């Protein structure tokens, strides 16, 4: 496949990693009696470990000669779950914070003491604003084609140079 990689369910070296990770925890398990808390903890760890290899095998990830999963970010839609889909997710949450935080500064600006409300949050007002950023791509778009997103060039102070 891409870059001469093989899928992880068919990699001979990915399977060896699964065995040696389980063998290491089994040889630690043998020094304890079967009902005790260290034996139940290591038994639960080998279940977590065994479920970690099974998950990847059917995942659809690509392995190398090293036996480790690789990620593809060319833009292929077949490997979307690797970068695109968690990427769109992060953009939604990061742009949500920046939008909401900016709404707050603009709101408390027209006031006697704007600086007072940055060290001591008006929580009822802040709480209201935080959840209005769920539709930010629409709200950031309405202000771009209004004139309320970016200011004019005669409103920004500039260094003597330019």
């Amino acid at each position: 496949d891409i870059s001469g990689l093989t899928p992880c369910k068919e990699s001979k070296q990915f399977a060896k990693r699964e065995k040696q990770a389980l063998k290491k925890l089994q040889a630690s398990l043998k020094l304890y009696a079967d009902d005790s808390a260290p034996a139940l903890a290591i038994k639960a760890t080998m279940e977590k470990t065994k479920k970690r290899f099974d998950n990847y095998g059917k995942y659809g990830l690509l392995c190398g000669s090293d036996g480790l999963p690789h990620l593809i970010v060319s833009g292929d839609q077949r490997h979307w779950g690797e970068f695109i889909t968690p990427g769109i997710l992060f953009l939604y949450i990061a742009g949500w914070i920046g939008w909401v935080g900016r709404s707050y500064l603009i709101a408390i600006r027209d006031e006697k003491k704007p600086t007072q409300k940055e060290i001591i949050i008006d929580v009822p007002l802040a709480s209201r604003l935080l959840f209005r950023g769920f539709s930010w791509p629409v709200a950031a778009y309405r202000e771009l084609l209004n004139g309320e997103l970016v200011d004019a060039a005669a409103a920004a102070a500039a260094a003597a140079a330019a």
């Binding site: 970690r52 990847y56 059917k58 990830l61 990620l71 979307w80 001591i120 949050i121």
Partner: protein, 41 residues
């Protein structure tokens, strides 16, 4: 107790409560849906 409420609204107290709620958010999701390298789950 309107002065304790203004004390609970100061920036470092709100930052630790917000982070405590948000670290524990990520810890809980990693407790039920662990080892999620990608969407494959």
């Amino acid at each position: 107790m309107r002065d304790l409420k203004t004390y609970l609204s100061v920036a470092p107290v709100a930052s630790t409560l917000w982070f405590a709620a948000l670290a524990g958010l990520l810890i809980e999701i990693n407790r039920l849906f662990p080892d999620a390298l990608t969407f494959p789950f």
